[PDB]
Amino acid sequence: PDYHEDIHTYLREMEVKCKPKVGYMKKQPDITNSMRAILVDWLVEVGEEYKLQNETLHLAVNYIDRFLSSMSVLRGKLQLVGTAAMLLASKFEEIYPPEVAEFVYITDDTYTKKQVLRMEHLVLKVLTFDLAAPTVNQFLTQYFLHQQPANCKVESLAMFLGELSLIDADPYLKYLPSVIAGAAFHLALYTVTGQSWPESLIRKTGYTLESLKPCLMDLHQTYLKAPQHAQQSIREKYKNSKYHGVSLLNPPETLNL
Template sequence: MDVSFEASLPLEVSMKLEAPRKLPNIMEVSDYAEDIYLYLREMEVKFKLNVDYMKNQPDTIENLRVLLLNWLVVEGQLLELQNETLHLAVNYFNRYLSLEPVSPETLQLLGIAALRLATKFEEAYPLRIIQLIHHRAGQYTKKQISEMECRMLQVLAFHLALPTINQFLTQYFLHQQQPNPHVESLAMFLGELCLVDTVTYLKYLPSVTAGAAFHLALYTVTGKSWPESLVQKTGYTLETLKPCLMDLHWTYFSASQHAVYSIPEKYRKPMYHGVAHIPPPETLNLE
């Protein structure tokens, strides 16, 4: 019995292949977008850290924290992580420090655990990245890292889906203008600089800091100001953002001497349009 394809009944099938339909971003679907935004605003208030969140930690922890942030930024680039993964890892790390005393010897282990959890939560293909993080973890065993992850989950009460500066920027503020890669990259650069100076920027909610970063980037690159559409959407005016804008303007001026040197280095690269080379404006438009 001939069962070859040639012996099959002749069929003429005309099939028109269509390009895959692009699924809508749920954040941009009008039926959901406003509710999601309001939920994020509620969550950022609920989980806001105090400026003195490290008061119960040893004095040496703050300096070591800066070194660890350098490491996280570098690892994020080497592993090609999403920027949101970095922001989440820093969020988990800071919140853990606010709740549990940590010895200097275990600080890097805590950072590794935070990065792994953020990777599992945010990245599309976390397994390969998790394996690479483990290979780069130095003196820590897989068992030690897993135990610290479990401990971090317990301390954070499994609250991992929290709003960040980056989330407000990328999902809301940067959509309020015509695409401009320089504005987008500069806003993300400024947002990352704020992760380091907790004494200054924990005074502000992530949405406020994101708004200040967006306005400063928009004004620096295009000369434009905080749009009326965002006043309507957020309730924030330039007067609302002014204290954070003043702080961020100073941070921008001192970026080349920033303690976490890896952030300016990252944003000097072509993939971010070299925005770290863009000089800050001498004055701010606050009207």
């Protein structure tokens, strides 16, 4: 009711400001998209194990991509950056974040408690404490309000697809969260109900199927190829009844776009 439009407008301004550098991986001498994929997949499992909000996961990946836009990291340290990011996102987003010992424990003692704490401080400095970033998740839940009527499977499938985009910096780093959410919502809607991106969201977002097309073409491929992807933790996660087992729904073969 009140503030829904003001908040949307504000998130659309901030997502431009909070966006990582699209090129950053080519400037990283020692890490790759493949290593990032492995890290993000591990963070999904951490979220599983400690029962963290989906929002916490998206925030952490945002912190990582922004950190890596200015800081060169060696491959043996990438997981430390990821652990600190997840700790920060947890402290920001969770009612009950896990304790620091729990974060040390799940890095299989690669790192010490002091390292994790020092990396937390470093990540805060580099991000200049700007932690309140817009995520695909935050756009999705607003878009869900435009369903007629609400459909739990559509919501869950949209969240699953939004989560898959986190894993692959190529191509997803080039799309804004609001755009990825638009593609994931349409694709979910289309898969479950056969319906399309509603004109009511065109009025709200200014996006049409035409302007969502590039992201949607990528996401559709990601969806088709998901069972063959080397990272599988998101598919496993979305088999649970919590998410209505949406990772077992068959993707459509074509979109018409």
